[PDB]
Design a protein around this nucleic acid. Sequence first.
RNA 1: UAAAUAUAGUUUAAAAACAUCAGAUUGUGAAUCUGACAACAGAGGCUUACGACCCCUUAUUUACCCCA
Lengths: 284, 255, 255, 255, 255
Amino acid sequence: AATREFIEMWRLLGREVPEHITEEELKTLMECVSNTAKKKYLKYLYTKEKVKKARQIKKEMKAAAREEAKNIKKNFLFLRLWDRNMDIAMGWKGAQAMQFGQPLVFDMAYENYMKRKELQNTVSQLLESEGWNRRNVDPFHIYFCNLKIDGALHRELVKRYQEKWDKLLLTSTEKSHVDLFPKDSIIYLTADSPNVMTTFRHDKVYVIGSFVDKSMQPGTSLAKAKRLNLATECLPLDKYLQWEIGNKNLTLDQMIRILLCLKNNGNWQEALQFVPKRKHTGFL
Amino acid sequence: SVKGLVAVITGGASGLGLATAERLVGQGASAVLLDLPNSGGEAQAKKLGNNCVFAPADVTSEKDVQTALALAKGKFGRVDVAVNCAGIAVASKTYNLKKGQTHTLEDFQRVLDVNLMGTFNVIRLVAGEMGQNEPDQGGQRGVIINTASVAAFEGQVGQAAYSASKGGIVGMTLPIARDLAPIGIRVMTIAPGLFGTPLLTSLPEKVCNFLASQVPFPSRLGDPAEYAHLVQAIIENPFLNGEVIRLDGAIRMQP
Amino acid sequence: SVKGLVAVITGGASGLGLATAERLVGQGASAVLLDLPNSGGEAQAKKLGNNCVFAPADVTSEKDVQTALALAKGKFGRVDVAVNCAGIAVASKTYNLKKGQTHTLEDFQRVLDVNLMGTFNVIRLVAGEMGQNEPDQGGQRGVIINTASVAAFEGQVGQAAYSASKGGIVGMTLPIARDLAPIGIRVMTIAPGLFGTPLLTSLPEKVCNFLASQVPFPSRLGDPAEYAHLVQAIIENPFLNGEVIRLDGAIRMQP
Amino acid sequence: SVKGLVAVITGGASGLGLATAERLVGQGASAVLLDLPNSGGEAQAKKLGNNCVFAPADVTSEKDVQTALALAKGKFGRVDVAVNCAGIAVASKTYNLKKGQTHTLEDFQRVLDVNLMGTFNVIRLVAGEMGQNEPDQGGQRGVIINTASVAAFEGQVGQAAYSASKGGIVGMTLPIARDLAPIGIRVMTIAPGLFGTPLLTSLPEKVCNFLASQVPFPSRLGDPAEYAHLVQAIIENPFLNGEVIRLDGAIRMQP
Amino acid sequence: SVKGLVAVITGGASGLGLATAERLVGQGASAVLLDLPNSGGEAQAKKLGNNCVFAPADVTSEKDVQTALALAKGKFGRVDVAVNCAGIAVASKTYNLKKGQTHTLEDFQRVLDVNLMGTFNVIRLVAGEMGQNEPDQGGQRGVIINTASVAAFEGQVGQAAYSASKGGIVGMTLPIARDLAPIGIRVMTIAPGLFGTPLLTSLPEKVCNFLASQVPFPSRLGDPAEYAHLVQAIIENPFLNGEVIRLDGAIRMQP
RNA sequence: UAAAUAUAGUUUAAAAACAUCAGAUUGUGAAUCUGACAACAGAGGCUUACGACCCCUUAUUUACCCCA
Ligand SMILES: *O[C@H]1[C@@H](O)[C@H](n2cnc3c(=O)[nH]c(N)nc32)O[C@@H]1COP(=O)(O)OP(=O)(O)OP(=O)(O)O
Ligand SMILES: C[S@@+](CC[C@H](N)C(=O)[O-])C[C@H]1O[C@@H](n2cnc3c(N)ncnc32)[C@H](O)[C@@H]1O
């Protein structure tokens, strides 16, 4: 394609472009319909390869430092199998959670409104979210709702989880949350909700929108939560935090960590400790 | 050798009971399938051939078990083996402070009735039937095999009712063995672990697969055929009495 | 220390329950005697003084236990300890071939109801009451102590019903301990052997004295006071959980 | 089936080992008799035919067991089953106040060495041999069966050393089962009670006759053939792992 | 009460032994710290005051224990309580197929020697010393308390040697209790779970935090003080004999 | 309306540190190894280049109160 030759002249001009581009990424260069959009894409690949190089250089630096250390160089109760045993322990908790645990829903109905960039970030955030849930003392029973089998978000989840996808102790279904739970016990979380969250309710199912809208579309979570007559709630960020800068729409990982410690009989202060510190200047 | 033995298998229309029936009938035993009328045991009895019959009975009911045992006497003339495989469970926590949920007393009663009281009902009634047998060369009149679970030892969260009922069967194995020892009936208990039974398959697929992986070896769900094999081994072995055998592949249940 | 603890003791009008009440009240605990209305628990409550009250309740009935627990909340404000000492036995053989007598199913049911179903009924209801407590420094909300028997392990002839019920309590100790562990309630089981309880002293002198002599050491019947001591020890030790402690003087019951 | 399996049977020149060898060889297995040089195992090996060989070894000695295992590899090409039947007992009281007689520490050591340390020595060395096997369809490489006793649970007076050694085998069954589970080796323990072995014949005729009578059912000494049957059942059953099976005819040893 | 009792505490210079010594001496008992010469036992004995002395001894050695017991008789005049807390632990897999590593026989021997043979050595020798005591009102001469582990029941991977030794102590508790019952010595076993003993607290903070979280309730490592409390409870309770008490906070060790 | 302001895991800095994910039966520096993910609000421009410079959108904060 002409794009392969196209990038050549951009390389000469030194517009922050990386050394080589994989054929996969060539396809995504065709997607960009603007010079400006191409610029933002090339810069991302430029910084990506730079960090790859720096990490590798720091890697083999460590490897060379480790091998020279080896040259320089009892009654135990336990073998060192802690990482293995922890994974098993977290497994047992996950199975228990799937039977008895409180539901928590991620709504995956937002693929349409997201671009490729935002879609990977959602999956990155989902990965972190499930992790914090896994490692918790009282895990949520995590539901992936409105997840198409052949969808982009499903395809991306499978890639990041590999064989672990099948073995994850969460429920993924193409069905909606209104189909799985009584409609009265569903509280949809969104920053745009007029209703403030006063206390964490253990009888309620909370729905979190799997939506990273860097290109901000306000009210989309609220619109879904109104089309289906669901209750909406927003976090008491205004009440407890001195908001100065930043978006009040938090990331998924932050949301779950706020809920997890709310569920675990914490107060709002302990909960809002996960709210990015750059966004507020203390508790009021 | 189990050729020419009549086994009354409780809950024999599915699960571990059906597996026991299949094996025993294959080895030349006669089987009576004692399950509920709706259990579809008639199809199973028809499948197994002439040497298997279906007796519709609730194990909690004395009248039902008596009628079923009478059917066995009518058809096959005697009873040599009783296998108790009838079982229900509930997954309910004793108390959930968060949700303000207490375990229902009715749930506890219903599980105890079927598992514990049902097993005892069969035992006390089949002991009468087995008592009428003339002793063999070894002085044996019958073998009674009960199914507990590993829940009797390592019960998970929400298994309180199930563990209580299975604990009861483990408890009363030895007393009953000592009771029936004069009249030459052997009482034995099997404690299956994770088997491919309807009880376990009712769990989420992801939870089942995890539980399978947690078995040391082999890392799979217990084949019901393996329970049938152990049943035959107990019947054949004259000197197995008053014991619980854990058939679990060396698994211990974590909470 | 057990100073200022409120103990709900079931079957507290006699036997091991009364012994527990006497000791706990002496050590500065408040006790609720939960026994049947006719058990003469009112006299016992009056004897023990101000820090003991009588709650007439049947342990099998949810309503009765709820009313009794409410009485505890009214009088003392909270519940810290539950001791399950209420229990009956029947001495009936499963089947005796000679005289052709079968264990009656009603007798089996009645023993199960009081021992197993009654214990569980108290547990599930006291867990609610204990749940309402603020955690102490150690995160503990309550201790639940159940009474099984050595019959749970080695039952004598004619103890099938009793062994089943006691087997159930031993079975379900661990599941319930795991259930209530998040809440911070410890579940413990004591398995007494032959104690000088009213039930044993009622038996013929020849039979009692022989059974006493068969205890390795000390060669005597268990003093109920010793049961009370072990109860206090369990309450005081905040690391005893999900275990059955055999208080039998090293006796194993012969067939 | 056990057709074409190679069993290394420890203490195979007499008692429960020989019974196991007889049965396994009859069912078409190849056996290695691992016993002491003087045990007369050569006659037994000659009697059992081509499919049985005698390997003189002391089980406490690593060199001896290695040579014996090498003989098995040479002759039969692999090792599939290990049965640990080798054992000694000493009948000495811990302390006799009347006579001022103390249990000899050497006696305790000698019993531990043969029963516990000998069993472990075989296990750790045969696990190496079994490890070299290609997994079958079920992923199984080998079965290791150990012989404890009912002494492990209810030890008689003067069986402190014997109970300690048998307690050790019961203890370490599960850890070893978990150890070898990745490899695909099943570890199982049988706990015989009162078998008609030469050891028990060595007791007075009056005492043996009494012990036989004290077995609930059947009221006789365990036939070694019954031990062999249970061994075969364990080998055949893919899902028996990390368990102790009491083969005692429902007897509990009184003090 | 434990006022005026002389306790010989084995491994008393650290861990659960020292905790037992601290409590007993505080309650007005006299203690003999029986530990290795190189343990900081002399400083511990000096710290505990006049009612505590240090006896340097190896528990495996008969001569050493005899000299230590003689020191107890010299200083305090008698021996009433023996607490066996001496132990070592080893983490070795039975066989590692990947690395071709076999468990060393010497490792197995040395663990057995200290844990099992050492405990028995103390028991048999203290029983002599306790035998010389005049019986109290209850006919009791002494109490012997042994420390097993939960490894005796659920041993993890690499705990084969440790589980064998702890299994042995659990096994031989009842035989020895029956042995010493005529003399009037009570034998009891405690089976601690995860305690803040030196070998656990040495671990990384992440590993400790995980171990704490594994315990159902309380979600913390066992304080050695809790072990001391249970020791005192056993000494005070006349009717606790021939039993293993699991002090584990309801934990079952996963593979 | 005007101003600053906007780090999608968190900070700091003007790229790192700490985190995340998958694999691992680890002999107790696994205190590791092999991979995955790497986008300073968003869109479009200008320029040799830039996170500067322009513009729009959304959002935050504050000020204003609307043409006082
Ligand atoms: O141009 C501004 C301005 O005239 C007016 N406005 C709104 N808030 C303020 C304020 O605090 N101070 C001043 N001086 N002026 C203010 O609103 C105009 C902007 O309105 P838009 O046309 O952008 O949006 P609109 O209100 O029509 O939006 P919507 O509410 O219908 O969605
Ligand atoms: C970044 S937000 C998505 C923003 C989207 N424009 C919307 O309208 O919600 C991702 C999810 O986190 C949750 N969330 C984030 N901030 C929240 C807040 N302040 N209150 C409640 N829920 C919040 C919501 O469930 C939301 O769908």
